[PDB]
Scaffold this motif. Structure first.
Motif, short mmCIF file in Angstrom:
data_model
loop_
_atom_site.label_atom_id
_atom_site.label_comp_id
_atom_site.label_asym_id
_atom_site.label_seq_id
_atom_site.Cartn_x
_atom_site.Cartn_y
_atom_site.Cartn_z
N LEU A 138 71.61 36.67 -76.23
CA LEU A 138 70.95 36.00 -77.28
C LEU A 138 71.03 34.43 -76.75
N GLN A 139 69.86 33.95 -76.61
CA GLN A 139 70.03 32.38 -76.11
C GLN A 139 70.75 31.53 -77.21
N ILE A 140 71.24 30.39 -76.88
CA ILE A 140 71.90 29.27 -77.47
C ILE A 140 72.13 28.19 -76.77
N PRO A 141 71.50 26.98 -77.39
CA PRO A 141 71.81 25.67 -76.66
C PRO A 141 73.18 25.23 -76.04
N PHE A 142 73.26 25.12 -74.84
CA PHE A 142 74.40 24.83 -74.18
C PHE A 142 75.57 23.83 -74.90
N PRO A 143 75.15 22.69 -75.49
CA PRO A 143 76.36 22.00 -76.18
C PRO A 143 76.71 23.22 -77.27
N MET A 144 75.98 23.90 -78.05
CA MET A 144 76.17 24.52 -79.06
C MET A 144 77.20 26.10 -78.44
N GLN A 145 76.88 26.20 -77.30
CA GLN A 145 77.65 27.02 -76.65
C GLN A 145 78.95 26.64 -76.43
N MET A 146 79.19 25.57 -75.91
CA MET A 146 80.41 24.90 -75.59
C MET A 146 81.31 24.51 -76.66
N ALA A 147 80.68 24.20 -77.89
CA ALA A 147 81.32 24.00 -78.89
C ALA A 147 82.15 25.37 -79.48
N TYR A 148 81.47 26.33 -79.26
CA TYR A 148 82.09 27.79 -79.67
C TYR A 148 83.39 28.07 -78.90
N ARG A 149 83.17 27.23 -77.63
CA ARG A 149 84.26 27.41 -76.70
C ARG A 149 85.46 26.57 -76.69
N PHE A 150 85.05 25.39 -77.53
CA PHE A 150 86.10 24.66 -78.13
C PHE A 150 86.90 25.38 -79.21
N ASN A 151 85.69 25.98 -80.01
CA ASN A 151 86.53 26.64 -81.22
C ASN A 151 87.59 27.79 -80.94
N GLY A 152 87.06 28.36 -79.78
CA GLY A 152 87.87 29.37 -79.25
C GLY A 152 89.19 28.98 -78.64
N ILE A 153 89.38 27.77 -78.56
CA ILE A 153 90.82 27.46 -77.87
C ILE A 153 91.47 26.67 -79.03
N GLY A 154 91.13 26.41 -80.15
CA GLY A 154 91.71 25.94 -81.28
C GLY A 154 91.40 24.53 -81.79
N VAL A 155 90.42 23.86 -80.87
CA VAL A 155 89.79 22.64 -80.94
C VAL A 155 88.67 22.71 -81.97
N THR A 156 88.75 21.97 -82.86
CA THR A 156 87.47 22.00 -83.88
C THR A 156 86.25 21.51 -83.22
N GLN A 157 85.19 22.02 -83.88
CA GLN A 157 83.81 21.99 -83.05
C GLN A 157 83.28 20.55 -83.19
#
Lengths: 49, 55
Positions: A1-20
């Motif tokens: 499932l495609q996803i724009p790379f800023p919005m991908q990376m924001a999910y990966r901040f959100n997975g380390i506890g830093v908000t989006q």
């Protein structure tokens, strides 16, 4: 499932506890540290054996 | 938790792994700063659920 790379990376901040919002409000900073760290990793192998 | 989708006209919030769209209210969003610094931001209403409870 495609996803724009800023919005991908924001999910990966959100997975380390830093908000989006930490991503977007610093997005151009984060891209610059990212590019300058991959630029630095050629030189960590194109140098010290 | 989730992501802002658009079906072409209106904007919604779904969970990220299964399409169920909700209305963007103020209890599934949070605010942070002005709408100036985020690169790519759309203008759509965020419906406050308190405001049609005065009447």
């Amino acid at each position: 499932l495609q996803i724009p790379f800023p919005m991908q990376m924001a999910y990966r901040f959100n997975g380390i506890g830093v908000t989006q919002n930490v991503l977007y409000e610093n997005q151009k900073l984060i891209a610059n540290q990212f590019n300058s760290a991959i630029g630095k990793i050629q030189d960590s192998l194109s140098s010290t054996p | 938790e989730g992501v802002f989708v658009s079906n072409g006209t209106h904007w919604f919030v779904t969970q990220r792994n299964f399409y169920e769209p909700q209305i963007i209210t103020t209890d599934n969003t949070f605010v942070s700063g002005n709408c100036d610094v985020v690169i790519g931001i759309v203008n759509n209403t965020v419906y406050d659920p308190l405001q049609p409870e005065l009447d």
